[PDB]
Every structure is written in structure tokens, then in C-alpha cells.
Design a binder for this molecule. Structure first.
Ligand SMILES: O=C(NC[C@@H]1Cc2ccccc2CN1c1nccnc1F)c1cccc2[nH]ncc12
Ligand SMILES: N[C@H](CCC(=O)O)C(=O)O
Ligand SMILES: N[C@H](CCC(=O)O)C(=O)O
Ligand SMILES: [Cl-]
Ligand SMILES: [Cl-]
Lengths: 248, 247
């Protein structure tokens, strides 16, 4: 079995990491559109065209399944990609919705969706949660988390101040937080710490991680050390250097 | 006269603002590569290709001069674009060197270059400054200023914390600060305020504004309006930004 993983750049490595530790595939063709990243600050028309173009990249690699690791592409382009595509394409949004159903039985539990601007604006997460019965959904574009994490600012007063900037306006105190962006797992502990420390919270909110959720989904569909090809629209060496650090 | 202005996205509006204020040109074709912005976190190979493709865009427009408003493309791609262009291309690095030569007589005056990671990595500013005899040159990639400014984070604790993060390891106390990036003029006052506070200065450092330097350069060099906006992303989003950046 040989699959491809598509992402806007290097944030996809947080999904690639979970896929690797589940050893469900033999061959993984990773493609990151690092020349044009990020997608989250751009518009639906551009993003959809990007997704269609990613389809053309994988054509000569003869994969049987495409994982869209990017939450932004999953939110804006997955539908259009699935139309033009003969192999199945699994994004990271629907699998997270399934994990929420399994881990969050109270449909009134306050859920907070975190993602890029484009992802939040699309309402992909909110619409899918509502169709599954959830009645207490909040969403927040935390755009600056992406560049902060990509600069390796994973702790310190800059990250803390960025979190306070996004989180201080929150009306509802969340029980569940959806990490609806490839980058956010790298600061998951810090997001937890923020809510425990800023509110009288003994335990932290529950965090839904997109890579762990797609793996659960994929395990409920396929059978039980993989080769990995790294491709990039930018400098592939720069992307590979990034991979070594993300996959730690 | 009809010219082109090229930028990676909306940052170039800080150059367009200076051009419009100076009333230099009757017709201006602005092109922002907003589908692929930012350039400054990317690699020299990618950026040079971006520059060459920018030339293909202006071909049907019959411009007489291309202003490369982007400091990153000025630093990595300008030499290659000029190889393949019959019309003169002017970037925003060389004009800033002239601005400094005109305003900074002392060769030992400490100059601090701020720009993207790619702009700083190229050493385009330091090399031109050393060639002109300046002895005290420092540089600093302040990458996160770009997404902060594009989020309209132009004041407050987050910006102040970002400035401190970048400026704290500074050895030198600058008399000159090159705003070597389209976005940085939008926080010029905050940068001045930072350095006056933390080094107890009676007057602010001299900030070199790329847009103002190119205006002065074009006036000296050419003895001297309708804008149309184009984008590789949604042009409506870029024009919405134009209203905000252009005052
Ligand atoms: O190829 C290896 N290293 C070089 C390659 C390119 C490169 C260039 C400049 C700085 C760093 C890197 C890291 N690189 C990659 N790192 C992770 C995944 N893929 C890669 F291509 C490699 C081989 C066997 C075990 C490893 N563990 N870590 C890396 C390796
Ligand atoms: N991969 C994107 C984050 C980076 C980007 O904006 O392209 C996501 O998962 O939303
Ligand atoms: N226009 C770029 C800033 C934004 C980008 O990185 O593309 C510059 O002047 O360096
Ligand atoms: Cl990292
Ligand atoms: Cl702004």
C-alpha cells in the first residue's frame, strides 16, 4: 500500500507523525506546497485551485489514497478535489468529527474550534458539529499561531501573550478544544496550561488532535517501517530539514 | 508615463502610498502576488522564479518602468529580472543606500538593517553599505512583524512583546534603522518609541523608509493618477486592503 500526504507546507508533519507511528502503510509520498504556504490567510477561490493542482502532482506517483493533512485545504478544497479524483481523498475534518462523537457524549458541552482564518470563515467544523447534534459551539481564528510555531516559538512570553490576545475575549469557557490546524499540536500543552491557569480549572479542556483522529478513522477502514518520499514546491531540502524537527 | 509596481502582496501599498503622494506618474499598474505571499520566509531559488514570473505579468501592459516594491524580491530576484528586461527595473534597496549616503555623513554611525529572513540572509543591504564605506552595520530578521502587521496588530502588548523579543539581544545602539521590508513603515512610530525608551535617547533614530527613498531616487534620476490593481489571489481582497494601507 502506497499513499500520498498533501499539505500547504511543513505543518503536515504532525499528521505524518501519527501516520508513521500507526504503521498502516508501506509507502507515503509527502508533498508540501511550501512555495505558496500559508493557505489559511488566503481566499476560497485560490485555495480550491491549490487543491486541484495538488491532485496533478500525485498523478504520476500512482497512489491509491490521498490524505489531505491540511485543515485549511480540507475545509475549502476537499469537495472539489473529490469530484476530479478517482482515488479516495480523506481530509482531517470529518475524522475529527467522528472522534468528537466518540469522546464527547454531552451535546451541550462547550466546544471551541481553533483554526486558520480561512478554516474558521468556511464554518466547516461548525456545520459538521451542528449536523451531529452539538448545540454549544464556539470558533476562533488564531492566525498568528501558525507563524509563531513555524519560527519555533513554542514557549515564553511571546507565545503566552499571543494566547492571551486570542483567548481573553472568549465568552464561554471551553470543555473541548479542536486543534483544527496542522500546527497547533506543537503548543497543545501550552494551550491546556493557559486554560487551567487563567480559569479555576483543575483538569484541562479536552483537545482533539487531527492526526490522531484521522488515524483512528483510517484504522476502522484498512488493515494492520514505511518508506517516505518528501516533495516540495519550494526547496525540498528546506522542507526535509523541517521534517526532521517536526517528526521528533 | 505608465509604470508597474510589483510586490508579493499588499505590503507594496506602503511604496504606492509614497508614489501617490509625490504625484509622479499618470498611470500605475500594481500587481500583488497575494496567492503566494510571503516571499521572505522562502528560499532564493523560489524567489528568483517568482521575480521572473512577475515580468511575464507586466508584458501585455506596456509599462515603461517596473518598480519592484518588495524588499525581498529586490534583494534576491532583481539582478535576474534585469537580465531579461528591456525596460528599466528599479528595486527598493539601492534607493535606500543613496538616502543613507545623503543623510548619514559619519561612517561610524551604527546602522541597523531590519527585514525578512531572506532579505537579511542575502546581505544585500550590508554589502551595499560596506561598499560605500560604512563601518558599523548590524542586521536583524524580524520575521513575525509581517504577519502581525497583516493582522493589523499595530499597537498593544503583543506588538511590544514581539519587538522586545527581536530587539533584546541587540548589541549596538543604532543611529539609523533601515525599514528593509514593505510592512515595517506601518509600525515605524512604535519602533522609534521602543529604541528611545530602552536606550534613553533624546531624539529617535533615523528611520529609512523604502517608499520615500525610491520616490527621492526616481525624482533625482528622472527629473520628474490612475491605479489599477491586480492580484494572483482574490483581487477584491487586495483592493479592500488598498483602502486601509493607502490611508
Ligand atoms: O536523510 C537524512 N538526513 C538528511 C535530510 C536532509 C537534511 C538537510 C539538511 C539538514 C537536515 C536534513 C535532514 N534530512 C531528513 N530528515 C528527516 C527526514 N527526512 C530527511 F530527508 C536522514 C537519514 C537517516 C536518518 C535520519 N534521521 N534524521 C534525518 C535522517
Ligand atoms: N496547513 C494549514 C496551516 C498552514 C497554512 O495556513 O497553510 C492548516 O492545517 O490549516
Ligand atoms: N514584501 C516583503 C514582505 C512580505 C513577504 O515576505 O512577502 C518584503 O518587503 O520583504
Ligand atoms: Cl518547529
Ligand atoms: Cl494594516
Amino acid at each position: 500500500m502506497k499513499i500520498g500526504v498533501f499539505d500547504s507546507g511543513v505543518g503536515g508533519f504532525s499528521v505524518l507523525k501519527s501516520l508513521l507511528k500507526a504503521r498502516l502503510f508501506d509507502e507515503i509520498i509527502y508533498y508540501g506546497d511550501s512555495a505558496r504556504v500559508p493557505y489559511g490567510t488566503k481566499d476560497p477561490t485560490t485555495i480550491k485551485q491549490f487543491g486541484l493542482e495538488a491532485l496533478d502532482f500525485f498523478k504520476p506517483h500512482e497512489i491509491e489514497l490521498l490524505i489531505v493533512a491540511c485543515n485549511t485545504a480540507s475545509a475549502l478544497a476537499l469537495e472539489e478535489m473529490q469530484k476530479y479524483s478517482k482515488i479516495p481523498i480523506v481530509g482531517v475534518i470529518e475524522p475529527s468529527i467522528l472522534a468528537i462523537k466518540r469522546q464527547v457524549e454531552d451535546k451541550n458541552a462547550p466546544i471551541l474550534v481553533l483554526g486558520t482564518k480561512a478554516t474558521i470563515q468556511s464554518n466547516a467544523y461548525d456545520n459538521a458539529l451542528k449536523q451531529q447534534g452539538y448545540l454549544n459551539i464556539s470558533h476562533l481564528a488564531t492566525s498568528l499561531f501558525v507563524p509563531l510555531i513555524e519560527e519555533s516559538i513554542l514557549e515564553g512570553e511571546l507565545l503566552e501573550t499571543c494566547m492571551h490576545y486570542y483567548f481573553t475575549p472568549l465568552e464561554i469557557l471551553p470543555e473541548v478544544i479542536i486543534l483544527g490546524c496542522t500546527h497547533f499540536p506543537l503548543i497543545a500543552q501550552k494551550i491546556e496550561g493557559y486554560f487551567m491557569g487563567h480559569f479555576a480549572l483543575p483538569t484541562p479542556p479536552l483537545l482533539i488532535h487531527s492526526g490522531d483522529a484521522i488515524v483512528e478513522y483510517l484504522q476502522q477502514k484498512y488493515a494492520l517501517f514505511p518508506k517516505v518520499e518528501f516533495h516540495a514546491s519550494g526547496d525540498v531540502i528546506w522542507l526535509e530539514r523541517q521534517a526532521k524537527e517536526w517528526l521528533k
